[PDB]
Coordinates of C-alpha atoms (C1' of nucleotides) and ligand atoms in Angstrom, one line a residue:
Chain A
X1 CA -13.1 -48.6 -111.5
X2 CA -16.5 -49.6 -110.0
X3 CA -17.5 -53.1 -108.9
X4 CA -19.3 -54.4 -112.0
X5 CA -21.7 -56.6 -110.0
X6 CA -22.3 -57.7 -106.5
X7 CA -19.8 -60.4 -105.5
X8 CA -21.9 -63.5 -105.8
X9 CA -22.5 -65.8 -102.8
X10 CA -19.6 -68.1 -103.6
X11 CA -16.9 -65.5 -103.5
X12 CA -17.6 -64.3 -100.0
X13 CA -16.5 -67.6 -98.5
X14 CA -13.9 -68.2 -101.2
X15 CA -12.2 -65.0 -100.2
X16 CA -12.6 -65.5 -96.5
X17 CA -10.9 -69.0 -96.4
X18 CA -7.7 -67.2 -95.5
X19 CA -9.2 -65.2 -92.7
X20 CA -8.8 -67.6 -89.8
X21 CA -7.9 -66.9 -86.2
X22 CA -4.9 -68.9 -84.8
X23 CA -3.7 -69.3 -81.2
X24 CA -0.5 -71.4 -80.9
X25 CA 2.2 -72.1 -78.4
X26 CA 0.4 -73.1 -75.2
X27 CA 2.0 -75.3 -72.5
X28 CA 1.4 -76.5 -69.0
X29 CA 2.9 -74.7 -66.0
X30 CA 5.8 -76.0 -63.9
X31 CA 3.6 -75.5 -60.9
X32 CA -0.1 -75.7 -61.8
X33 CA -0.3 -77.4 -65.3
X34 CA -2.3 -74.5 -66.8
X35 CA -1.8 -74.3 -70.6
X36 CA 0.2 -71.1 -70.8
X37 CA 2.5 -69.6 -73.4
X38 CA 6.1 -70.8 -74.0
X39 CA 8.6 -68.1 -73.1
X40 CA 6.1 -66.3 -71.0
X41 CA 5.5 -65.5 -67.3
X42 CA 2.6 -67.4 -65.9
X43 CA -0.1 -64.9 -64.8
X44 CA -1.3 -67.1 -62.0
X45 CA 1.9 -69.0 -61.0
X46 CA 4.5 -66.3 -61.9
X47 CA 7.5 -68.6 -62.4
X48 CA 10.4 -69.4 -64.6
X49 CA 11.1 -72.9 -63.4
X50 CA 10.7 -72.4 -59.7
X51 CA 11.3 -68.7 -59.2
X52 CA 9.1 -66.2 -57.4
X53 CA 9.3 -63.9 -60.3
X54 CA 6.2 -61.8 -59.8
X55 CA 6.7 -61.3 -56.1
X56 CA 7.8 -58.7 -53.6
Chain B
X1 CA -31.6 -86.6 -65.1
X2 CA -31.0 -84.9 -68.4
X3 CA -27.7 -83.6 -69.8
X4 CA -26.9 -80.6 -72.0
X5 CA -27.5 -77.3 -70.1
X6 CA -27.4 -74.1 -72.1
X7 CA -26.9 -70.3 -71.6
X8 CA -27.6 -67.4 -73.9
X9 CA -26.0 -64.0 -74.2
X10 CA -28.2 -61.3 -75.7
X11 CA -27.6 -57.8 -77.2
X12 CA -23.9 -58.1 -77.6
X13 CA -22.6 -54.8 -78.9
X14 CA -20.2 -56.2 -81.6
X15 CA -20.5 -57.7 -85.1
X16 CA -21.0 -61.2 -86.2
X17 CA -17.9 -61.1 -88.4
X18 CA -15.7 -60.4 -85.4
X19 CA -17.3 -63.1 -83.3
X20 CA -17.6 -66.1 -85.7
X21 CA -13.8 -66.0 -85.9
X22 CA -13.6 -66.8 -82.2
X23 CA -16.1 -69.7 -82.3
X24 CA -14.1 -71.3 -85.0
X25 CA -11.7 -72.0 -82.1
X26 CA -14.0 -73.5 -79.5
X27 CA -16.3 -76.1 -81.1
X28 CA -14.9 -79.5 -80.7
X29 CA -13.0 -79.0 -77.4
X30 CA -13.7 -79.5 -73.7
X31 CA -14.1 -77.0 -70.9
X32 CA -10.5 -77.2 -69.8
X33 CA -9.4 -76.4 -73.4
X34 CA -12.0 -73.6 -73.6
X35 CA -11.1 -71.2 -70.8
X36 CA -7.4 -71.9 -71.6
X37 CA -7.8 -70.8 -75.2
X38 CA -10.0 -67.9 -74.3
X39 CA -7.6 -66.4 -71.8
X40 CA -4.9 -65.7 -74.4
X41 CA -6.9 -63.8 -77.0
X42 CA -6.3 -60.2 -78.2
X43 CA -9.9 -59.6 -79.1
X44 CA -13.2 -58.3 -77.7
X45 CA -14.7 -61.8 -77.3
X46 CA -12.5 -62.5 -74.2
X47 CA -14.8 -60.7 -71.8
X48 CA -17.9 -62.2 -73.4
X49 CA -17.6 -65.9 -74.2
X50 CA -15.7 -66.6 -71.0
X51 CA -18.6 -65.4 -68.9
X52 CA -21.0 -67.3 -71.2
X53 CA -19.1 -70.4 -70.4
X54 CA -19.0 -69.6 -66.7
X55 CA -22.8 -69.3 -66.6
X56 CA -23.0 -72.5 -68.6
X57 CA -20.9 -74.3 -66.0
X58 CA -23.1 -72.8 -63.2
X59 CA -26.2 -74.0 -64.9
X60 CA -24.7 -77.4 -65.3
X61 CA -24.0 -77.5 -61.6
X62 CA -26.9 -75.8 -59.7
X63 CA -29.7 -77.2 -61.7
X64 CA -29.0 -80.3 -63.7
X65 CA -25.7 -82.2 -63.6
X66 CA -22.5 -83.2 -62.0
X67 CA -19.0 -84.0 -63.4
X68 CA -17.9 -80.5 -64.3
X69 CA -14.6 -81.6 -65.7
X70 CA -16.2 -84.0 -68.2
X71 CA -18.3 -81.5 -70.2
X72 CA -17.9 -80.8 -73.9
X73 CA -18.9 -77.7 -75.8
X74 CA -21.1 -79.3 -78.4
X75 CA -22.3 -76.3 -80.4
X76 CA -22.6 -72.6 -80.2
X77 CA -24.0 -69.7 -82.1
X78 CA -23.5 -66.0 -83.0
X79 CA -26.7 -64.5 -84.5
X80 CA -27.4 -61.1 -85.9
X81 CA -29.0 -58.8 -83.3
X82 CA -30.9 -55.6 -84.0
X83 CA -28.8 -52.8 -85.5
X84 CA -28.4 -49.2 -84.6
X85 CA -28.5 -46.4 -87.2
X86 CA -26.7 -43.1 -86.9
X87 CA -25.0 -40.7 -89.4
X88 CA -21.9 -38.6 -89.9
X89 CA -21.4 -35.5 -92.0
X90 CA -19.3 -36.5 -95.0
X91 CA -17.8 -33.6 -96.9
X92 CA -19.5 -31.2 -99.3
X93 CA -22.6 -30.9 -97.1
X94 CA -24.2 -34.3 -97.9
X95 CA -24.7 -37.3 -95.6
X96 CA -23.6 -41.0 -95.5
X97 CA -24.9 -44.1 -93.8
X98 CA -22.8 -45.8 -91.0
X99 CA -24.1 -48.8 -89.1
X100 CA -23.8 -50.0 -85.6
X101 CA -24.6 -53.6 -84.8
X102 CA -25.3 -56.0 -82.0
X103 CA -25.5 -59.8 -81.8
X104 CA -27.2 -62.6 -80.0
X105 CA -24.9 -65.4 -78.8
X106 CA -25.6 -68.9 -77.5
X107 CA -23.4 -71.8 -76.5
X108 CA -24.5 -75.4 -76.1
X109 CA -22.7 -77.5 -73.5
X110 CA -23.4 -81.3 -73.5
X111 CA -21.7 -83.7 -71.2
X112 CA -20.1 -86.3 -73.6
Chain C
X1 CA 19.5 -49.4 -85.4
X2 CA 15.9 -49.0 -84.5
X3 CA 13.2 -46.4 -85.2
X4 CA 10.1 -45.4 -83.2
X5 CA 9.8 -41.6 -83.6
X6 CA 11.9 -38.8 -85.1
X7 CA 15.6 -38.1 -84.6
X8 CA 15.8 -36.1 -81.4
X9 CA 12.8 -37.7 -79.8
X10 CA 14.7 -41.0 -79.3
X11 CA 17.3 -39.2 -77.3
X12 CA 14.4 -37.6 -75.4
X13 CA 12.8 -41.0 -74.7
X14 CA 16.0 -42.6 -73.6
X15 CA 16.7 -39.8 -71.2
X16 CA 13.1 -40.2 -70.0
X17 CA 12.9 -43.9 -69.3
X18 CA 16.4 -44.5 -68.0
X19 CA 16.3 -42.5 -64.8
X20 CA 14.3 -45.5 -63.7
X21 CA 16.4 -48.6 -63.7
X22 CA 18.4 -46.0 -61.7
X23 CA 15.7 -45.6 -59.1
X24 CA 13.2 -48.4 -59.3
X25 CA 15.0 -51.2 -61.2
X26 CA 11.5 -52.3 -62.4
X27 CA 9.9 -51.0 -65.6
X28 CA 6.8 -52.3 -67.4
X29 CA 7.1 -51.4 -71.1
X30 CA 7.1 -53.0 -74.6
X31 CA 9.6 -54.8 -76.8
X32 CA 11.6 -52.2 -78.6
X33 CA 11.9 -49.8 -75.7
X34 CA 13.3 -52.7 -73.7
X35 CA 16.0 -53.5 -76.2
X36 CA 17.1 -49.9 -76.6
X37 CA 17.3 -49.5 -72.9
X38 CA 19.3 -52.8 -72.8
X39 CA 22.0 -51.2 -75.0
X40 CA 22.0 -47.8 -73.2
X41 CA 22.2 -49.1 -69.6
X42 CA 24.8 -51.7 -70.7
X43 CA 26.8 -48.7 -71.6
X44 CA 25.9 -46.5 -68.7
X45 CA 26.7 -48.9 -66.0
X46 CA 30.3 -49.3 -67.1
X47 CA 30.9 -45.6 -66.7
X48 CA 29.8 -46.0 -63.1
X49 CA 32.9 -48.1 -62.4
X50 CA 35.7 -45.6 -63.3
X51 CA 35.0 -42.6 -61.1
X52 CA 37.1 -40.4 -63.5
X53 CA 36.4 -36.8 -64.1
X54 CA 35.4 -38.0 -67.5
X55 CA 32.9 -40.3 -65.8
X56 CA 31.3 -37.4 -63.8
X57 CA 31.4 -35.4 -67.1
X58 CA 29.8 -37.9 -69.3
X59 CA 27.2 -39.0 -66.9
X60 CA 25.5 -35.6 -67.4
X61 CA 24.1 -36.6 -70.8
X62 CA 22.1 -39.8 -70.5
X63 CA 20.9 -38.9 -67.0
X64 CA 18.3 -36.3 -66.2
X65 CA 19.8 -33.4 -64.4
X66 CA 18.3 -33.4 -60.9
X67 CA 16.0 -36.3 -59.9
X68 CA 15.6 -36.9 -56.2
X69 CA 15.4 -40.2 -54.4
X70 CA 15.3 -39.5 -50.7
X71 CA 14.8 -42.3 -48.2
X72 CA 17.6 -41.8 -45.8
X73 CA 18.8 -39.3 -43.2
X74 CA 20.8 -39.0 -40.0
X75 CA 19.5 -35.6 -39.2
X76 CA 19.4 -34.2 -42.8
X77 CA 17.7 -34.6 -46.1
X78 CA 20.3 -36.6 -48.2
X79 CA 19.2 -36.5 -51.8
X80 CA 20.4 -39.6 -53.7
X81 CA 20.3 -37.6 -57.0
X82 CA 20.3 -40.5 -59.5
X83 CA 24.0 -39.8 -60.5
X84 CA 25.4 -39.9 -57.0
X85 CA 23.4 -43.2 -56.8
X86 CA 25.4 -44.3 -59.9
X87 CA 28.8 -43.4 -58.4
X88 CA 27.9 -44.8 -55.0
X89 CA 26.1 -48.0 -55.9
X90 CA 26.7 -49.4 -59.3
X91 CA 30.4 -49.6 -59.2
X92 CA 30.2 -51.1 -55.7
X93 CA 27.5 -53.5 -56.9
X94 CA 29.2 -54.6 -60.1
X95 CA 32.8 -54.7 -58.9
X96 CA 33.4 -58.1 -60.5
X97 CA 30.3 -58.6 -62.7
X98 CA 31.2 -58.5 -66.4
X99 CA 28.7 -57.5 -69.1
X100 CA 25.1 -58.4 -69.3
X101 CA 23.6 -56.7 -66.2
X102 CA 19.9 -56.9 -66.9
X103 CA 17.0 -59.3 -67.6
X104 CA 14.0 -59.0 -69.9
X105 CA 10.7 -60.8 -69.3
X106 CA 7.7 -61.6 -71.5
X107 CA 4.4 -61.2 -69.7
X108 CA 1.3 -60.0 -71.4
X109 CA -0.2 -58.1 -74.3
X110 CA -2.0 -54.8 -73.5
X111 CA -5.7 -54.3 -73.1
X112 CA -5.8 -51.2 -75.2
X113 CA -3.6 -51.4 -78.2
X114 CA -2.2 -55.0 -78.2
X115 CA 1.2 -54.0 -76.9
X116 CA 3.2 -57.0 -75.6
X117 CA 4.8 -56.1 -72.4
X118 CA 8.2 -56.5 -70.7
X119 CA 9.6 -56.3 -67.2
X120 CA 13.2 -55.2 -66.9
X121 CA 15.2 -55.8 -63.7
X122 CA 18.9 -56.0 -63.2
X123 CA 20.2 -58.9 -61.2
Chain D
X1 CA -15.6 -16.8 -94.5
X2 CA -18.8 -15.0 -93.8
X3 CA -22.1 -16.9 -93.6
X4 CA -25.7 -15.7 -93.6
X5 CA -28.1 -16.3 -90.8
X6 CA -26.6 -13.9 -88.3
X7 CA -28.5 -13.1 -85.1
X8 CA -29.6 -10.0 -83.3
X9 CA -32.4 -9.1 -80.9
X10 CA -33.4 -5.7 -82.4
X11 CA -33.4 -6.8 -86.0
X12 CA -35.4 -10.0 -85.7
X13 CA -37.9 -8.1 -83.6
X14 CA -38.3 -5.0 -85.7
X15 CA -38.7 -7.0 -88.9
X16 CA -40.6 -10.0 -87.8
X17 CA -42.0 -8.6 -84.6
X18 CA -45.6 -8.5 -83.6
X19 CA -46.3 -4.9 -84.2
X20 CA -44.9 -4.8 -87.7
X21 CA -47.3 -7.3 -88.9
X22 CA -50.1 -5.3 -87.3
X23 CA -49.2 -1.9 -88.8
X24 CA -50.1 -2.9 -92.4
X25 CA -52.7 -4.8 -94.4
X26 CA -50.5 -7.5 -95.8
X27 CA -49.4 -9.0 -92.5
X28 CA -53.0 -9.2 -91.6
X29 CA -53.3 -11.8 -94.4
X30 CA -50.4 -13.6 -92.8
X31 CA -52.0 -13.6 -89.3
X32 CA -55.3 -15.1 -90.3
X33 CA -53.7 -17.4 -92.8
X34 CA -51.5 -18.9 -90.0
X35 CA -54.4 -18.9 -87.5
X36 CA -56.2 -21.0 -90.1
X37 CA -53.3 -23.4 -90.0
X38 CA -53.2 -24.2 -86.3
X39 CA -49.6 -23.2 -85.9
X40 CA -48.7 -21.7 -82.5
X41 CA -45.8 -19.4 -83.3
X42 CA -47.3 -16.4 -85.0
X43 CA -44.2 -14.3 -85.3
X44 CA -41.8 -12.5 -82.9
Chain E
rU1 C1' 12.2 -110.0 -106.0
rU2 C1' 11.8 -107.8 -111.0
rA3 C1' 8.8 -106.0 -115.2
rA4 C1' 4.3 -104.0 -118.3
rG5 C1' -0.6 -102.2 -117.0
rU6 C1' -4.8 -100.9 -114.2
rG7 C1' -5.8 -97.9 -110.2
rA8 C1' -10.3 -96.9 -105.3
rA9 C1' -10.7 -93.4 -100.8
rU10 C1' -9.3 -88.9 -97.3
rA11 C1' -11.9 -81.5 -98.8
rA12 C1' -8.3 -75.9 -96.1
rG13 C1' -13.0 -74.9 -98.8
rG14 C1' -17.4 -75.1 -101.9
rG15 C1' -22.2 -76.8 -104.5
rC16 C1' -27.6 -79.2 -104.2
rG17 C1' -31.3 -81.1 -100.4
rC18 C1' -33.4 -81.5 -95.5
rA19 C1' -34.0 -79.7 -90.7
rC20 C1' -33.6 -75.9 -86.7
rG21 C1' -32.7 -70.9 -85.4
rG22 C1' -32.1 -65.4 -85.5
rU23 C1' -32.8 -59.8 -87.8
rG24 C1' -38.0 -58.1 -90.6
rG25 C1' -43.0 -56.7 -90.0
rA26 C1' -45.8 -58.1 -95.6
rU27 C1' -50.5 -60.4 -94.6
rG28 C1' -55.2 -62.6 -91.2
rC29 C1' -58.5 -60.3 -87.8
rC30 C1' -60.1 -55.9 -84.7
rU31 C1' -61.2 -50.5 -83.6
rU32 C1' -60.7 -45.4 -80.0
rG33 C1' -61.0 -42.6 -85.7
rG34 C1' -62.2 -40.7 -90.4
rC35 C1' -65.4 -39.9 -95.4
rA36 C1' -70.2 -38.6 -97.8
rC37 C1' -75.0 -37.6 -96.5
rU38 C1' -80.6 -37.6 -94.0
rA39 C1' -83.9 -35.0 -90.7
rG40 C1' -84.6 -30.9 -87.5
rG41 C1' -82.0 -26.8 -84.4
rA42 C1' -79.2 -22.6 -85.3
rG43 C1' -76.9 -18.7 -88.5
rC44 C1' -73.1 -13.4 -85.3
rC45 C1' -69.7 -11.9 -81.3
rG46 C1' -68.2 -7.2 -80.1
rA47 C1' -66.1 0.0 -75.6
rU48 C1' -71.0 -3.4 -70.4
rG49 C1' -63.8 -5.0 -73.5
rA50 C1' -64.7 -9.7 -78.4
rA51 C1' -62.3 -13.8 -82.1
rG52 C1' -57.2 -15.3 -80.1
rG53 C1' -53.7 -15.9 -76.4
rA54 C1' -49.5 -14.6 -72.5
rC55 C1' -49.1 -15.7 -67.5
rG56 C1' -50.6 -18.5 -63.4
rG57 C1' -54.3 -21.6 -59.8
rG58 C1' -53.3 -28.6 -56.9
rA59 C1' -49.9 -32.3 -50.9
rC60 C1' -46.5 -34.5 -54.3
rU61 C1' -46.1 -30.6 -60.7
rA62 C1' -43.0 -32.0 -66.7
rA63 C1' -47.5 -31.7 -69.9
rC64 C1' -53.1 -32.1 -71.2
rA65 C1' -57.7 -30.6 -69.7
rC66 C1' -60.9 -27.0 -66.4
rC67 C1' -60.4 -22.4 -64.2
rG68 C1' -58.7 -17.1 -62.8
rA69 C1' -56.0 -13.7 -56.5
rU70 C1' -63.0 -15.8 -54.6
rA71 C1' -58.1 -19.5 -59.4
rU72 C1' -58.2 -28.0 -60.1
rG73 C1' -63.2 -23.2 -57.6
rC74 C1' -68.2 -19.5 -54.9
rU75 C1' -74.1 -19.2 -54.5
rU76 C1' -79.1 -20.7 -55.8
rU77 C1' -83.1 -24.0 -58.1
rG78 C1' -84.5 -28.8 -60.0
rG79 C1' -82.7 -34.5 -61.2
rG80 C1' -80.1 -37.8 -58.1
rG81 C1' -79.1 -41.2 -53.7
Chain F
rU1 C1' -48.8 -46.8 -96.9
rA2 C1' -56.4 -47.2 -96.6
rG3 C1' -59.3 -43.1 -94.0
rU4 C1' -58.4 -35.7 -92.8
rG5 C1' -51.6 -34.3 -92.9
rA6 C1' -53.1 -36.0 -87.9
rA7 C1' -57.0 -43.4 -84.7
rC8 C1' -50.8 -41.9 -80.6
rC9 C1' -50.5 -35.0 -76.2
rA10 C1' -49.8 -32.9 -84.6
rG11 C1' -50.1 -28.6 -87.9
rU12 C1' -46.3 -31.0 -83.1
rA13 C1' -41.0 -32.7 -83.6
rC14 C1' -38.2 -30.9 -87.8
rC15 C1' -36.1 -27.6 -92.4
rG16 C1' -36.4 -22.0 -94.1
rU17 C1' -34.2 -14.6 -91.6
rG18 C1' -38.6 -14.7 -94.2
rA19 C1' -43.4 -15.8 -96.6
rG20 C1' -43.8 -20.7 -95.9
rG21 C1' -42.6 -25.7 -96.3
rG22 C1' -44.2 -29.8 -93.0
rA23 C1' -43.0 -36.3 -91.2
rA24 C1' -43.1 -41.6 -89.0
rA25 C1' -45.3 -43.8 -84.9
rG26 C1' -52.7 -48.5 -83.0
rG27 C1' -53.0 -54.4 -80.9
rU28 C1' -49.7 -58.7 -74.2
rG29 C1' -53.6 -61.1 -71.0
rA30 C1' -60.0 -63.1 -70.3
rA31 C1' -58.0 -60.7 -65.3
rA32 C1' -50.9 -57.5 -64.3
rA33 C1' -52.4 -62.1 -61.9
rG34 C1' -46.1 -57.8 -65.1
rC35 C1' -41.9 -63.7 -63.0
rA36 C1' -41.2 -63.9 -54.5
rC37 C1' -37.0 -67.0 -53.7
rC38 C1' -32.2 -69.9 -55.5
rC39 C1' -27.7 -69.3 -58.8
rC40 C1' -23.7 -66.9 -62.7
rG41 C1' -22.2 -62.1 -63.8
rG42 C1' -20.1 -55.2 -61.7
rA43 C1' -24.2 -54.8 -64.6
rA44 C1' -27.0 -55.9 -68.7
rG45 C1' -28.1 -60.6 -70.2
rG46 C1' -29.5 -65.3 -68.4
rG47 C1' -30.9 -70.7 -66.0
rG48 C1' -34.0 -72.9 -62.3
rA49 C1' -38.2 -72.5 -59.3
rG50 C1' -43.2 -70.1 -59.6
rU51 C1' -47.8 -67.2 -62.2
rG52 C1' -50.9 -68.2 -65.9
rA53 C1' -55.3 -72.9 -70.0
rA54 C1' -51.2 -71.6 -72.9
rA55 C1' -44.9 -67.6 -72.1
rU56 C1' -42.2 -69.7 -79.1
rA57 C1' -48.6 -64.6 -74.6
rG58 C1' -42.8 -61.9 -70.8
rA59 C1' -44.0 -55.4 -71.4
rU60 C1' -39.3 -53.6 -78.8
rC61 C1' -44.9 -57.9 -75.8
rC62 C1' -51.5 -61.4 -81.1
rU63 C1' -50.6 -65.0 -85.6
rG64 C1' -44.8 -63.6 -87.9
rA65 C1' -44.2 -64.4 -95.1
rA66 C1' -40.0 -62.8 -98.4
rA67 C1' -35.0 -60.6 -98.9
rC68 C1' -30.6 -61.3 -95.4
rC69 C1' -27.3 -64.2 -91.9
rG70 C1' -26.0 -68.5 -88.9
rU71 C1' -26.0 -74.4 -87.4
rG72 C1' -25.7 -79.6 -88.6
rU73 C1' -26.3 -83.5 -91.8
rG74 C1' -27.7 -87.3 -97.2
rC75 C1' -25.1 -87.0 -102.1
rC76 C1' -21.2 -84.5 -105.4
rU77 C1' -16.3 -81.7 -106.4
rA78 C1' -9.1 -80.2 -107.5
rC79 C1' -7.1 -81.5 -115.8
rA80 C1' -11.0 -78.2 -115.3
rA81 C1' -13.7 -72.9 -119.9
Chain G
rG1 C1' -36.4 -53.5 -94.7
rU2 C1' -31.9 -55.8 -96.6
rA3 C1' -26.9 -56.6 -99.4
rU4 C1' -22.7 -55.2 -102.5
rG5 C1' -18.1 -53.2 -102.6
rA6 C1' -15.5 -54.5 -97.4
rG7 C1' -13.6 -55.3 -92.1
rU8 C1' -11.2 -52.0 -97.7
rA9 C1' -10.9 -46.4 -97.3
rG10 C1' -10.8 -43.0 -93.4
rC11 C1' -10.5 -42.2 -87.4
rG12 C1' -10.6 -34.4 -89.4
rA13 C1' -2.3 -30.5 -88.7
rA14 C1' 0.8 -30.6 -83.4
rA15 C1' 6.1 -35.0 -78.2
rG16 C1' 5.5 -37.2 -74.2
rA17 C1' 7.6 -41.0 -70.3
rC18 C1' 7.7 -43.4 -65.5
rA19 C1' 6.0 -44.3 -60.5
rG20 C1' 1.9 -44.4 -57.0
rG21 C1' -3.6 -44.2 -56.3
rU22 C1' -9.7 -45.7 -56.6
rG23 C1' -11.8 -49.3 -59.3
rA24 C1' -14.7 -55.8 -62.1
rG25 C1' -11.2 -54.4 -65.8
rA26 C1' -6.7 -48.8 -67.8
rA27 C1' -2.2 -46.2 -73.1
rU28 C1' -6.9 -42.5 -72.4
rC29 C1' -9.3 -41.5 -65.0
rC30 C1' -6.7 -39.2 -60.8
rU31 C1' -1.9 -37.8 -58.0
rG32 C1' 3.7 -37.0 -58.3
rU33 C1' 8.4 -36.0 -61.1
rC34 C1' 11.0 -34.5 -65.4
rC35 C1' 10.7 -32.9 -70.5
rA36 C1' 8.3 -30.0 -74.4
rC37 C1' 4.9 -26.0 -77.5
rC38 C1' 3.3 -20.8 -77.7
rG39 C1' 4.3 -16.1 -75.9
rU40 C1' 1.1 -8.5 -79.8
rA41 C1' -0.4 -14.6 -77.8
rU42 C1' -3.2 -21.0 -77.2
rG43 C1' -2.2 -14.8 -71.4
rA44 C1' -6.0 -11.1 -69.0
rC45 C1' -10.9 -8.0 -69.5
rU46 C1' -15.3 -7.2 -72.1
rA47 C1' -19.7 -5.6 -76.3
rA48 C1' -22.8 -8.6 -79.3
rG49 C1' -24.0 -13.6 -79.7
rG50 C1' -25.4 -18.1 -76.9
rU51 C1' -29.5 -19.2 -73.3
rU52 C1' -28.0 -22.4 -67.7
rU53 C1' -23.7 -25.6 -70.5
rC54 C1' -22.1 -22.9 -63.8
rC55 C1' -21.3 -25.4 -58.7
rU56 C1' -22.0 -29.8 -55.4
rG57 C1' -23.0 -35.3 -55.2
rG58 C1' -23.8 -39.9 -57.9
rG59 C1' -24.4 -43.2 -63.1
rG60 C1' -22.6 -45.4 -67.5
rA61 C1' -27.5 -47.9 -72.6
rA62 C1' -27.3 -43.7 -75.7
rG63 C1' -23.7 -39.3 -77.2
rG64 C1' -17.8 -38.6 -77.6
rC65 C1' -15.0 -40.9 -85.1
rU66 C1' -10.9 -45.8 -79.5
rC67 C1' -11.7 -47.1 -74.6
rG68 C1' -13.7 -44.5 -70.9
rU69 C1' -14.3 -45.5 -63.4
rC70 C1' -14.2 -38.9 -66.7
rC71 C1' -17.5 -34.7 -69.4
rG72 C1' -19.8 -28.9 -71.8
rC73 C1' -23.6 -36.1 -71.3
rC74 C1' -27.5 -38.0 -68.0
rC75 C1' -30.0 -38.0 -62.6
rA76 C1' -30.8 -35.1 -58.0
rG77 C1' -30.2 -30.6 -55.5
rG78 C1' -28.2 -25.6 -55.4
rG79 C1' -26.6 -20.7 -57.5
rU80 C1' -27.0 -14.7 -61.0
Ligands
ZN201 ZN1 2.9 -71.8 -63.9

RNA sequence: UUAAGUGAAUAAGGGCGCACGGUGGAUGCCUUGGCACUAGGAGCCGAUGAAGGACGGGACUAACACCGAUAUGCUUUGGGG
RNA sequence: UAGUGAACCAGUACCGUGAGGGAAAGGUGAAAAGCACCCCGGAAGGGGAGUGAAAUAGAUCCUGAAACCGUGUGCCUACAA
RNA sequence: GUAUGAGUAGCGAAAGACAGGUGAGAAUCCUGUCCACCGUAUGACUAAGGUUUCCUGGGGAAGGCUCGUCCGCCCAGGGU
């Protein structure tokens, strides 16, 4: 219908418990040790175990 | 000398709800953790808090301290900047309020 | 099966993309486009091995009709027309290679609409 | 749909023009009553 | 070692307190401006073109104010230095 | 928010074809002395170094209350209407 | 002046894809190819109406229901 009252000050946080941000899956390079994503091309190295992948 | 340089970002054209999420994920970590986490974010804070940390590092170098790699983000803030107020015509000829917001953001960098 | 759009627009899109990986062999797109182009080019290489008059006359569906790629001459303008490039390279590149001709990478999300991106190359 | 406030250059100058508040004695009320308000735009 | 019983503490979050910050201008204080009057002056301007304005006049020109092709001004008499 | 509607370039901006309806908006410093130069960043924004008695007096600029939103900590909380 | 509902509703009919450019940064900017939509009309000319939005060269705080290196937006000149 209509919100019967204002949501009191407890329930703002007690809702927003499950509103976190998560970043996961970060690992060092094979060439510079920078904490980059598993199963992902390094933006600075550009390698899958010793390959000039991003190269011309 | 004295430790704990600081740097402030002012009039940041976003919300606080969309910024306090990101600075759940920084407080308690070192500098090498910090830029590493911030490079892989799908959000607006990436362009912001990174340059805040870079200025914090340059203020730790050029003015106060040494040992750049042994610095810890102790605390940080996102605070409610001055808003901006404009309107949009809702249907049936009447009006409706729609906000725009800013924020003021600070980050505290102690040594250890 | 997969879905991105309506019925005939998928056939439109797969004729659209897949004239590159015939010319460039590098394409920067998303997840689902990459996997559909996997399946289609895994098909349409194998019909570049036969050389039959069924191969010339089924290549005219998943290939756009006339697309130039001209970097050669002797004293001419020789137009490697993205189907002659099939029947003059891809057989004689994959004479002994069995299935699985391509590779998919996982680089980056997108600045605009959070699209995770993929490079596709062959060998 | 038709709506109301439609423009011309003859009509809104031969209804609210300067002469046709001079040619009577009930626009002369309006002239002095607006000049005793300080408003610049008298009429067309 | 068995058996019967007694069992403390760790918080994704939250409450109460303290302390520090932001967004907001209530209040303190001040006036260049108003309100009501006192005491005098003064109580019409106009076909010799009015009350009001339009347009224009500067080195730089968007506005205010002053002015009118003699246009951000002409001449004379007194104060002035 | 008093005081004319109007202490500020107001019967203006603005609403109404019309006649007419008509708003909010004063305060750095004693003197702009209004932050040369260094550094981050494309910039904005900043941190030093300076000015200044004082900058939490830095041009949204005197003191700055409430509502609102952040930070960290002393004590409490998962068998409870 | 500030919450609440709440980062919920909605983002106001319609097919795009790749490569290459300038740029701090691109799904939206530019350039090239192919595909597609309308075709008594989303093509051409004018009378009102609008009152400079037109062109040239720059900028990105505002505006644009996203960004925006672009604009009918702004700054400066120039045109009837
Ligand atoms: Zn690497």
